[PDB]
Amino acid sequence: AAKDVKFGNDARVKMLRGVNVLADAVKVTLGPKGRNVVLDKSFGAPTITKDGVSVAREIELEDKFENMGAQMVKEVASKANDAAGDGTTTATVLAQAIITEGLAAVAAGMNPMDLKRGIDKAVTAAVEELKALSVPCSDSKAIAQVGTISANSDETVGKLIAEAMDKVGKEGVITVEDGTGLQDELDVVEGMQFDRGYLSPYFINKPETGAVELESPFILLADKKISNIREMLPVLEAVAKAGKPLLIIAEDVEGEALATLVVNTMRGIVKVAAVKAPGFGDRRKAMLQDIATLTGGTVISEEIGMELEKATLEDLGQAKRVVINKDTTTIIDGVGEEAAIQGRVAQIRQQIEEATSDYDREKLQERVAKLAGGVAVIKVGAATEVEMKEKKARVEDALHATRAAVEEGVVAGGGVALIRVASKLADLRGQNEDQNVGIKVALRAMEAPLRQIVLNCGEEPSVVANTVKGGDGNYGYNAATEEYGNMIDMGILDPTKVTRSALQYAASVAGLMITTECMVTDLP
Amino acid sequence: AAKDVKFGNDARVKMLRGVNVLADAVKVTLGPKGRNVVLDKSFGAPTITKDGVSVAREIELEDKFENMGAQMVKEVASKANDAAGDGTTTATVLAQAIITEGLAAVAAGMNPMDLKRGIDKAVTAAVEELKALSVPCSDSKAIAQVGTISANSDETVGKLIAEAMDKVGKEGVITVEDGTGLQDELDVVEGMQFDRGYLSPYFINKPETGAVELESPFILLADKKISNIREMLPVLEAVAKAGKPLLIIAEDVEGEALATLVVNTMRGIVKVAAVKAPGFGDRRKAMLQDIATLTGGTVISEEIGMELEKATLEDLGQAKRVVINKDTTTIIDGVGEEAAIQGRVAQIRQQIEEATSDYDREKLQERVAKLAGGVAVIKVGAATEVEMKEKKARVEDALHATRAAVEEGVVAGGGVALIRVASKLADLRGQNEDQNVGIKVALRAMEAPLRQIVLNCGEEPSVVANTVKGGDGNYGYNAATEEYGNMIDMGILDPTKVTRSALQYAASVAGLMITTECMVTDLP
Amino acid sequence: VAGGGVALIRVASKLADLRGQNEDQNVGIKVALRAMEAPLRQIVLNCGEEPSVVANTVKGGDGNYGYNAATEEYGNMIDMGILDPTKVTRSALQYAASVAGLMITTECMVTDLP
Amino acid sequence: AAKDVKFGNDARVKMLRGVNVLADAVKVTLGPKGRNVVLDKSFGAPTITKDGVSVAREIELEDKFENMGAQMVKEVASKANDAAGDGTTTATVLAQAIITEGLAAVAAGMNPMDLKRGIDKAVTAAVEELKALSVPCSDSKAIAQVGTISANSDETVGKLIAEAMDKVGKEGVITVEDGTGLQDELDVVEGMQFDRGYLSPYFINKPETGAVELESPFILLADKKISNIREMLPVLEAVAKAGKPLLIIAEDVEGEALATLVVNTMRGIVKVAAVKAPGFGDRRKAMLQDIATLTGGTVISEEIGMELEKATLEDLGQAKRVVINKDTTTIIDGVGEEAAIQGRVAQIRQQIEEATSDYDREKLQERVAKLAGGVAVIKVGAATEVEMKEKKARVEDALHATRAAVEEGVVAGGGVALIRVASKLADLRGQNEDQNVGIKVALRAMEAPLRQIVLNCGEEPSVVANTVKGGDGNYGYNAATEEYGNMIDMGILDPTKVTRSALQYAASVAGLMITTECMVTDLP
């Protein structure tokens, strides 16, 4: 198609304008005094929300260049929430601050590349100071406290998360499902989790979390790439008959088969979802067999001369639930008999001994950890379902937050960590003056979220900022109570992982935009 | 699609103009001297109505932002009518008053959140004062009186209702249906009512009542989430023969299945409605079986491996009638054997003995209450179908009003209760000045309905308001007769519940609009 | 009195308990008190410093303590030789309020046609 | 009249565009390879010129704001030529550089006042480095070299100027006239010069110099301020007979009288020009009397009761020539008797013995130096009238430059003094970073003239700039011969006074414009 090509200053102003729409929309929601955004729906009543992730999702602009800006920040910022379970909005206001100052500078005649290098130096430093400020969360006393705080002072939720983590370990797999009737339950079931996400959205049956959820599905395990639905049909009919869901695991699923499957389950014919088999090379075949043992299926490989058309319901594995992310798949309550599974574990566990290589040994260890590890399942009861769904939501958010803490610790929330960390870097320098301007740009940017929060409250951002900078450690401003003090003690905190991800991703995309000299889109 | 995004002042005035159209259209109908609204139809001659709910239903605006506004108040205000059987028009004029003043204040530079907090404080204060002002309706004399007043002073109607409540209790389930000839009938039948409403509008075949009404329908009881109508087809085609309607009670009806159900029943192919199964977890399955017994159907649960395709007409339950609200499902005259039903009752009642907890007990007592309780059916007699249909309608309204009265009592109608209550709160204060302005905003808005009624009467609203503020208790202005005095004595009253509801939902949606800083909609 | 507008903001900071006959009157009072911060906020603004912060710091101290905008230094304004005659500050405030009062109470304007 | 008022950023770009037209116009004339600018005249053929002053005089822009900018730099830059006899184009290109960069910085959010401070520091430091870099012009051999170089290498002009200064001293008054024939002449005559200029333009009959030149005029001396032309009329008519011009020396000539004089001398009858009496107070009356003695006139003062109405041709003074600048009046060959003049010298010289105060001693010394010192008249001869006029011009120019050189010395021309100095100041810092940017702005600005010159020569500006920055002292680029070397040795030089003046006035106006936040003009 004939394109429209814009260069330099213009490309930059269009982009700025697009992200300004995006950020100005999302940042009104920041903090406890945050405002509402109303999002129209063609059918039904409009949606009222304080959730900036939702708001971001809705933003698309008419002008193509402006939309490019908005969509760039939108995506890279999504990556923050994806990593730590939170921080997308923050990533966004940071991005907006850095880009505004950065562009100002570039247009003022400073070198885009030197500015980017300075920004990134400042960010690296900031992440280290962040490691310094972080308060560790390690014994389950801290664990339960953190979960509790994230649950909005529900101590039951803290007790719960901590019990789960002690049962399955801190790195162990934990699931949440609806409760049976007002008492919580906790059980370890046969299960596994690996890093492969859906091969396409539209498989998503749980739009809140953006995930795939299947109950008691059969699971198809085939070691080959599946490009054509011609091989699949008999197994698909056995699955149409047994009226159960189905999970496809292959070397990959592409093209004809992929489109036909998406179209098919979206039209409600034979509900199916597909993900890639984990890993590559020989360990791919092996892990495929591991999952087979866990779920009680048989791997179908062309290598042994097995064909997918002659495959039946019997060759398949099975489990009670599966949940699939953008990047993660979790298999819950697998049917495979205990003999097969623990004997397989013994095999691999002996392979750990016979290991001639450190790498190989560790790969085998990963495998036994997953297979033998099992899955923690929290069933949330409330007495009257409303209270249950609410609590359950609270439990899931708290869980993500607690995992982030368990990994990297917690820091003062409400953006005082960022403004703190930033207050310490004033002496930071680069290789030349442009680099230095880049550094100062980022430091000023780290003041943005706290200032937005303070603004939504009707207070003067510069004064609050001044007071917080004047103090030390985790000293900051509690926007909720309008009270200064120690932010951890006052129970206002973010996982260190969350703030780090927010700043890093923000700075990444801002750097990319600051260094963009040309844009290409289609003509209207 | 590409969006249009508005901020702050711009979006707020937009919203304001939208709710002003809705309210101004709706409030012309208020009071005894209320005016007519003419609603166009593509087919035939237009509708002339004094009913503000219908008017509300019709309002949709050309401007997307303005439409969002109107739709918001429409949605939250509709709820008062949902709860109390009345109060939606009131809620809307109340809301308009709160919104106009509130946004006015916001526009002056006051803190939106503080305005909100102050409004909510005045509303809490007010609901309490309403309980203070409230007059109990307890004995069946007063009950019959309230009924007679809601039927437009038809004592037959009062007599009938009081007789119904005496047969099934004040909390008991009561129904109204067409009569078999001139004279009324009253019968108690096996039946149940639980709080789950239609899973979608468009299921409504009776727009006067905002209800779904099905005669001699089949009932499908499934313990499953139903996502795919392919599962339904044998059952739906089987129900398409025998030419009877179908009620789906399941864990939920989602996506494809729901969409197809809506479409099919709206194109007249098979009349169908879907509702959520009551409760959650295990006791959900228990109640489902309760319903199954009541209707002589069979619950289809995946747990033992039953599939919906393998369901036949015989697995379906039946009743002479079902009625579905937004929040309610009521089943009338089930086919279930008296032996079966009574045996299930016996079982639950012994389960009550072994109960190791009060919680378990109260839940069971609720269940046997429903099952053993049955349903009162009032058949309205007339002589000439026209008179019957009319009287029936009046009986329904009176029924709803009387139930609202038995629950929370009655207070002086004509919007004078609200203004009385506001006069008692003149000293109410907040944490700061903006909070105080919010309070005064609410107190002043509470004068709006009365003031409107009086305007429609062609009288001077301020003078009447002033005179009413000057008196005490249930002293107020009777607009029909242009007479001041004791409003309860004059038979002009509202259930305390509907006035409460109107005020609360009004303040709710108003609070939300006052805190909206951004709106996102599609492009024209 | 202390110049650079700190006399007006001092004076204003002492009147926080001033109340009128009703709420609109109360609003009148706060409008005017808040207005008295305007000259220093402006002075500070032209200097490229943050008006709100300086204002804040000045209100916190007492007497003729204020901000010297020339030197960016806090202290005793009079001791720093920075002052206005009391008469000029009064006249500025009083006349300002006079015309402002008149404009606020103006309901109609008549001028010739273009 | 109603005004158009622009603020801030908008106003600044208006100014920027205005000085951009002026400068881009003037700066093409700069190199020895400088280009031509063509100036339309309504009657006859257009003017082809390389004189940037001439170009500047013509520039007036349609947009009132753009015009304000242009006129600002135009006026203060004119002040440079006025001080040193040269440097106006330089001042203008310098100003354009500083304004462009400075406003860039301001728009990027740097403090206007701090940028001004930084610029002003850099210039003060630079003027010092310029003084260090300066070469003295002291012995008359050096004086003759400077004159010769300024004369386009005519050793005759150097000879002339040196002989002239030797006749009258370094500070003595020197004038140039038409020669009476081939082979120049020099004579010292009775004459004087004091610093008072015309009281108004439009008195100018010599637009080339922008000066007043009157031949054999009458001189009026009044110790009064003249507000009304009625007192003047008999005197104006007395001057009207004998058909000679008239010089007014008074306390002042104001309002009606001055306007009427400008007007009358503009209609071509009664050619007259007016100036203030030199000095003020009592020393002014004394000095007036000195001029009276020199010219053989009589002071007319009201103190002794003399009135202008009774003044005749006899009271009027006389001289062979008078020349009046914007800032200077010089009177050449007065009719006063040698006795009168030398006797007045004796009066004052005896007053010097009696002085009990040093200040008075200095003032009297000033007066006898002026009186007894006389005026040098250089009469320039050549072969043909044309050659004579050409040479006369070369002599006038050379004299300006040589005077400037005797005062402050010479520095490397071709704009390399500026770029040299700038290279010496690279380490200079201010009180904060904004001040630093100010400093770098001015330093960068100092390269602009040389860069312009190299561009006009068709060579690469960055490259030449660089090579000159690499050497030391008076090392630079000769644009004419495209040869690098020692600029003074190659005979390419500017008086230190003109380069200094240029940089200072340029930075002056630039400083003002950068700190301009509001512009006010008339409506179109």
Side-chain angles (χ1 to χ4, degrees), chain B residues 344-514:
Chain B
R344 182 79 174 175
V345 171
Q347 292 177 26
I348 304 180
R349 201 154 261 166
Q350 155 176 37
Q351 300 199 291
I352 295 185
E353 306 308 315
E354 316 176 321
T356 61
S357 171
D358 264 327
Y359 181 68
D360 308 1
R361 189 168 296 111
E362 315 193 339
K363 288 312 173 182
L364 294 166
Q365 281 165 1
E366 287 180 44
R367 295 207 289 131
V368 282
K370 277 168 164 46
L371 209 43
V375 172
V377 168
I378 307 179
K379 284 172 179 179
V380 186
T384 76
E385 188 191 47
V386 186
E387 298 178 357
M388 191 270 294
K389 301 292 183 184
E390 203 281 325
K391 190 182 182 189
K392 177 186 188 296
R394 272 187 292 111
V395 170
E396 285 163 346
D397 282 23
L399 181 54
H400 287 75
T402 296
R403 179 61 65 94
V406 150
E407 282 171 21
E408 296 176 38
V410 301
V411 291
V416 341
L418 283 172
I419 200 164
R420 167 69 49 233
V421 147
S423 80
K424 288 187 154 50
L425 295 172
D427 281 322
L428 188 60
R429 297 284 178 280
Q431 287 165 24
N432 59 74
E433 186 48 39
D434 292 348
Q435 294 206 177
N436 292 344
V437 173
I439 295 181
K440 293 303 171 191
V441 160
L443 292 188
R444 261 184 288 117
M446 295 174 202
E447 302 187 41
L450 180 148
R451 278 168 174 275
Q452 187 55 45
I453 298 179
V454 169
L455 188 84
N456 297 353
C457 290
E459 295 295 321
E460 285 173 309
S462 43
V463 174
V464 171
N466 195 59
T467 297
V468 173
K469 286 187 204 161
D472 287 300
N474 289 287
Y475 173 76
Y477 177 82
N478 181 344
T481 73
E482 305 201 339
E483 284 283 340
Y484 300 86
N486 186 284
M487 301 292 299
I488 304 290
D489 292 344
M490 289 190 277
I492 299 191
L493 48 80
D494 289 307
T496 311
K497 187 176 182 186
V498 353
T499 298
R500 167 175 68 73
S501 298
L503 179 56
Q504 294 185 316
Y505 283 117
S508 169
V509 62
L512 294 183
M513 278 197 32
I514 288 172

Side-chain angles (χ1 to χ4, degrees), chain B residues 68-142:
Chain B
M68 286 160 95
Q71 296 307 319
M72 284 182 266
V73 180
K74 211 169 133 189
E75 196 66 19
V76 168
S78 91
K79 288 178 184 180
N81 240 86
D82 290 330
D86 189 32
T88 275
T89 297
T90 307
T92 310
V93 348
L94 287 178
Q96 172 190 28
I98 305 178
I99 288 168
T100 293
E101 284 304 309
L103 296 189
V106 167
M110 293 175 225
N111 200 302
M113 299 298 304
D114 279 330
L115 294 167
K116 179 180 154 55
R117 208 163 295 148
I119 287 169
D120 291 331
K121 188 170 190 173
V123 178
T124 304
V127 172
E128 227 63 25
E129 222 65 50
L130 222 32
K131 286 184 190 171
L133 192 59
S134 175
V135 169
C137 176
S138 299
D139 54 34
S140 52
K141 175 192 175 185

Side-chain angles (χ1 to χ4, degrees), chain A residues 21 24-25 33 35-40 45-46 48 58-62 179-182 240-242 267-271 382-385 388 457-458, chain B residues 1-3 5 7 64 68 71-72 75 111-113 117 196 225 227-228 230 256 279-282 284 307 359 363 512 515-521 523:
Chain A
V21 176
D24 290 345
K33 308 291 203 65
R35 313 298 175 78
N36 287 116
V37 181
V38 186
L39 306 175
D40 207 19
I48 306 175
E58 295 306 313
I59 298 294
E60 186 191 331
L61 308 192
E62 179 165 42
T180 49
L182 180 252
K241 262 289 182 47
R267 294 187 180 170
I269 321 169
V270 189
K271 216 86 162 172
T384 74
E385 188 191 47
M388 190 268 292
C457 299
Chain B
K3 308 295 195 310
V5 176
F7 295 98
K64 295 271 180 53
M68 286 160 95
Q71 296 307 319
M72 284 182 266
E75 196 66 19
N111 200 302
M113 299 298 304
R117 208 163 295 148
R196 293 290 200 180
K225 297 192 189 103
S227 301
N228 308 281
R230 177 179 174 179
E256 196 249 295
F280 73 100
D282 307 326
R284 172 204 288 131
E307 297 175 324
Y359 181 68
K363 288 312 173 182
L512 294 183
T515 57
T516 289
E517 264 281 318
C518 180
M519 311 180 74
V520 179
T521 186
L523 247 5

Side-chain angles (χ1 to χ4, degrees), chain A residues 148-302:
Chain A
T148 297
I149 297 180
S150 320
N152 192 64
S153 297
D154 183 347
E155 311 190 316
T156 316
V157 179
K159 180 186 175 66
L160 257 169
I161 289 171
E163 293 180 3
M165 305 199 84
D166 189 59
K167 279 292 193 58
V168 296
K170 303 179 185 182
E171 304 291 311
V173 177
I174 302 176
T175 320
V176 193
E177 46 191 65
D178 300 335
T180 49
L182 180 252
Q183 190 180 357
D184 303 308
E185 296 179 355
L186 173 63
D187 283 311
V188 174
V189 297
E190 293 302 337
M192 208 186 84
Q193 161 176 94
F194 55 75
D195 323 303
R196 296 292 194 183
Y198 44 68
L199 279 181
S200 165
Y202 305 99
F203 281 139
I204 310 180
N205 45 24
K206 286 283 185 178
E208 310 98 322
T209 37
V212 176
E213 196 172 300
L214 312 179
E215 310 206 306
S216 281
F218 280 109
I219 306 178
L220 175 59
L221 311 157
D223 187 10
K224 64 162 297 190
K225 301 190 189 175
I226 296 178
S227 300
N228 301 130
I229 204 170
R230 179 175 177 176
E231 309 176 353
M232 292 296 292
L233 297 185
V235 190
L236 280 180
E237 290 175 308
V239 165
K241 262 289 182 47
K244 293 188 172 182
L246 170 67
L247 181 66
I248 307 293
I249 301 181
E251 195 172 316
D252 205 343
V253 171
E254 298 164 23
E256 194 246 292
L258 183 58
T260 322
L261 286 186
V262 167
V263 163
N264 274 14
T265 83
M266 208 161 57
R267 294 187 180 170
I269 321 169
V270 189
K271 216 86 162 172
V272 182
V275 300
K276 283 178 182 180
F280 73 100
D282 309 323
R283 81 154 185 155
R284 174 202 287 132
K285 317 190 177 186
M287 290 188 72
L288 241 179
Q289 183 48 243
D290 284 350
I291 307 182
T293 304
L294 192 274
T295 68
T298 308
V299 181
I300 313 173
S301 50
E302 296 176 311

Side-chain angles (χ1 to χ4, degrees), chain A residues 20-31 34-35 37 52 55 89-90 92-93 96-97 448-449 452-453 455-456, chain B residues 7 517-518:
Chain A
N20 277 330
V21 176
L22 169 60
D24 290 345
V26 151
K27 71 177 187 184
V28 298
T29 69
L30 206 58
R35 313 298 175 78
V37 181
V55 179
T89 303
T90 308
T92 307
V93 352
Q96 175 187 231
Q452 188 56 47
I453 292 182
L455 186 81
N456 295 350
Chain B
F7 295 98
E517 264 281 318
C518 180

Side-chain angles (χ1 to χ4, degrees), chain D residues 443-521:
Chain D
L443 290 189
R444 234 184 292 125
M446 294 174 201
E447 299 186 39
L450 184 149
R451 276 166 170 277
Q452 190 57 48
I453 294 181
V454 171
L455 188 81
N456 293 352
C457 296
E459 292 293 321
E460 284 175 308
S462 325
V463 173
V464 172
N466 203 62
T467 302
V468 172
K469 286 188 286 183
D472 286 301
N474 291 288
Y475 180 75
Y477 182 83
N478 179 342
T481 68
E482 304 201 339
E483 300 286 340
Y484 295 93
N486 185 281
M487 298 289 299
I488 315 290
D489 294 345
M490 291 191 277
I492 302 191
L493 43 78
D494 297 315
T496 311
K497 189 177 181 188
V498 349
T499 303
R500 171 179 69 74
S501 296
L503 182 55
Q504 290 184 310
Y505 285 117
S508 165
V509 67
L512 294 183
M513 278 196 30
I514 285 171
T515 56
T516 293
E517 264 285 322
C518 179
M519 309 180 73
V520 182
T521 187

